[PDB]
Design an enzyme around this catalytic site. Structure first.
Site, PDB file in Angstrom:
ATOM      1  N   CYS A  93       2.823   1.046   9.609  1.00  0.00           N
ATOM      2  CA  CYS A  93       2.921  -0.161   9.007  1.00  0.00           C
ATOM      3  C   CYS A  93       4.245  -0.436   8.402  1.00  0.00           C
ATOM      4  O   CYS A  93       5.153   0.253   8.370  1.00  0.00           O
ATOM      5  CB  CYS A  93       1.955   0.304   7.778  1.00  0.00           C
ATOM      6  SG  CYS A  93       0.415   0.587   8.058  1.00  0.00           S
ATOM      7  N   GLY A 100       1.881   5.714  10.254  1.00  0.00           N
ATOM      8  CA  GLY A 100       3.143   5.523   9.942  1.00  0.00           C
ATOM      9  C   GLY A 100       3.723   4.197  10.343  1.00  0.00           C
ATOM     10  O   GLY A 100       4.824   3.897  10.160  1.00  0.00           O
ATOM     11  N   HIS A 125       0.818  -1.078   0.056  1.00  0.00           N
ATOM     12  CA  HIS A 125      -0.030  -0.010  -0.025  1.00  0.00           C
ATOM     13  C   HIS A 125       0.935   1.289  -0.055  1.00  0.00           C
ATOM     14  O   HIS A 125       0.199   2.399  -0.248  1.00  0.00           O
ATOM     15  CB  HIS A 125      -0.890  -0.110   1.202  1.00  0.00           C
ATOM     16  CG  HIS A 125      -2.056   0.687   1.040  1.00  0.00           C
ATOM     17  ND1 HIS A 125      -3.233   0.086   0.595  1.00  0.00           N
ATOM     18  CD2 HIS A 125      -2.333   2.114   0.817  1.00  0.00           C
ATOM     19  CE1 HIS A 125      -4.326   1.338   0.359  1.00  0.00           C
ATOM     20  NE2 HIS A 125      -3.637   2.302   0.827  1.00  0.00           N
TER      21      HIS A 125
END
Lengths: 304, 304
Positions: free
Chosen positions: A145, A143, A41
């Protein structure tokens, strides 16, 4: 003695964390050998998630669109590919701190440590269980991930989780390191939610064995139950039905303590039906289900 | 979102841990610069603790009676001294992984991370609070002494705890890194025990603010209380009386959430008097008191 929710030491994983930036999106990646792994993503803008064609989005990117920072140093991306929901960025430098490692996919009820990271830097460590509904109860902000979950065996780091998303109830979903989501979740804006979160019965029993090892024995009784009788009570109170496989993996703790598994089931059944008398087991007024039988043996004897 | 008992990343402290052996006693030491710090009890045999004259025991020792192992490597002890309940062994090699560090003494109610170690090697990490009775709820086995507790600020490790002993209720006592015990405890076989463990009120309120930040607001109400009225209820249920200093340090969280401290006290007072309706706050059926106001800000905003 004493018994705490205990994570693995994080130093081996700290040396693997880097920052990955694509467009205006910044998150974490895992740097092993000359590959950086991160959620696919990262290639989406804000508005790309509505109906993301990840294939088309990645085809439009080149290597120089991926910025990787290890501490103060830029790593040059020299290749990129997609595997399920994970991006693999080839870089020109092998991580000098690469640990011995494996990629494993864990089962519901199993536990692992999470190293929460921001800006490619470690911030905190805590212990999680993969819930029966295939979520974890994490602590993750924007932030985070690309933060990973792991277990350690000797010097070998088994990576089992990469963080991707947060569900409406404040619990979390992610993938193994091959990019396959745990559970029915996907990296798309659809009406996903965590189902009912069942209590991990075999883990509660393991924790009761931990209590006996630590000198808490007040809940034991001299009367045994049957597996069928126990499960009748387990269905109410929202406990997983206890299987013969679950009884099997409690065997080592049963032998160590001298308490038969079905005797501990009788103790647990009494605790469920009559409640805890404001009473503590291992200092907790609640029954804990985020320790596996292996976790109990490790914390009580193995760590020495 | 989500909120978990979160420890600091342990890698900086992992590189400081060594094994110290004296006679038949083996435990851990902390290697910083060219000094190794460890509990002075390493110089006692089994039977020496009955009436240990640590001064006489150490006078009888020489440098070669102390064996220090860093991984596979023997470190040569070239000097030794005693500071309160800690031994300081000078070694011929400075630790190449020495972090920037401070030795701090913390207050009751403050929190820190513990790196539990055996044989000079890290085994697990978990978060602790210094209880009002000056014990910690640790997980420690034989050989864990010399394990340390710490906080991290930026790149600076603040060491605040070294582990020495276990009390009858399965809780733990130790020193700061200057060798001074927290609380009235001593490294002698006397009839020591943890007193009543009061609930850390300011920390419970901080955790309720964490719940509001995470979207749990059902326990809020539109009626305020007074500090005196709240404390009347706090004395029952075994909560610390809330002081003006405690109200002061909740200020930043009160400003961030828009909930006045005395409004949160009114919410907590209702929760104590009427109980929790089998209800969860942040997923817990119990009120948590091992997060400081700083811990909440760090986990909710600071880690980013």
């Amino acid at each position: 003695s004493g018994f705490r929710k205990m994570a693995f030491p994080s130093g081996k994983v700290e040396g693997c964390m880097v920052q990955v930036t694509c467009g205006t999106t910044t998150l974490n990646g895992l740097w092993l050998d000359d590959v950086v792994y991160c959620p696919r993503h990262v290639i989406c803008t804000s508005e790309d998630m509505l109906n993301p064609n990840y294939e088309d989005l990645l085809i439009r990117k080149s290597n120089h669109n991926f910025l990787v920072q290890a501490g103060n140093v830029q790593l040059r991306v020299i290749g990129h590919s997609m595997q399920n929901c994970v991006l693999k960025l080839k870089v020109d430098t092998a991580n000098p701190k690469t640990p011995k490692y494996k990629f494993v996919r864990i089962q519901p009820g199993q536990t692992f440590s999470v190293l929460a990271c921001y800006n490619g830097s470690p911030s905190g460590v805590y212990q999680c269980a993969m819930r029966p509904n295939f979520t974890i109860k994490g602590s993750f902000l924007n932030g985070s991930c690309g933060s990973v979950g792991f277990n350690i065996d000797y010097d070998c780091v088994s990576f089992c989780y990469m963080h991707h998303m947060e569900l409406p109830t404040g619990v979390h979903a992610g993938t193994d390191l091959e990019g396959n989501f745990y559970g029915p979740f996907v990296d798309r804006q659809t009406a996903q939610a965590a189902g009912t979160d069942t209590t991990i019965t075999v883990n509660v029993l393991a924790w009761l064995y931990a209590a006996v090892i630590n000198g808490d024995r007040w809940f034991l009784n001299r009367f045994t139950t049957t597996l069928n009788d126990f499960n009748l009570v387990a269905m109410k109170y929202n406990y997983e039905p206890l299987t013969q496989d679950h009884v099997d993996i409690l065997g080592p703790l049963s032998a160590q303590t001298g308490i038969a598994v079905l005797d501990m089931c009788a103790s647990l059944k009494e605790l469920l039906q009559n409640g805890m008398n404001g009473r503590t087991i291992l200092g907790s007024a609640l029954l804990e289900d985020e320790f596996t039988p292996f976790d109990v043996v490790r914390q009580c004897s193995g760590v020495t």
